[PDB]
């Protein structure tokens, strides 16, 4: 099994301090249940908020699917992500819920599909949406530091990664044991990167380093 304390000694490296990340020192608890409804910004259309159903639970993350669309574009969001909110938030903020990109019906049917889908469903209580963590004021990451990062090619996977480079407010995430094809640059305050030990603390799944 994988253990950071041992891996760090094996690779002769150190893990990035938790203060470097925009993640809560004490991870948020996940009280959501599969089947619950909520609002989520369309991963394929940021300007649109759609109705989403919880398909799965993993650690402090939710596997979501936009109601009215197929099951081939599911995405993962932390319970304290600003991209998810309780039903009713969109309108309360003066916006209008949008059909998902990939909606299987005619746009005009959206109004009734909405009531239908939300009818007799369990709306995730606001109590389930945890407080957003504070943003570290500066990028404190240093090249070589290790962490846990989401493989954006396979979002369900969180893997051992290293800060390959630092440029201003950006960091170059590289995946231990895998080809550069999975690497990516992101803002230091990205919600897709976590301090070593995050998966263990949240009950999520941390992939072992690549065997290639």
Curated annotation (Swiss-Prot):
Ranges for the MBT repeats: 2-100, 108-209
Coiled-coil residues: none
Localization in the cell: Nucleus
Disulfide-bonded cysteines: none
Tissue: Highly expressed in placenta, thymus and testis. Detected at lower levels in brain, liver, skeletal muscle, pancreas and ovary.
Function field: Putative Polycomb group (PcG) protein. PcG proteins act by forming multiprotein complexes, which are required to maintain the transcriptionally repressive state of homeotic genes throughout development.
UniProt similarity note: Belongs to the SCM family.
The protein, known as: Sex comb on midleg-like protein 2
Range within the parent protein: 32 to 243 of 700
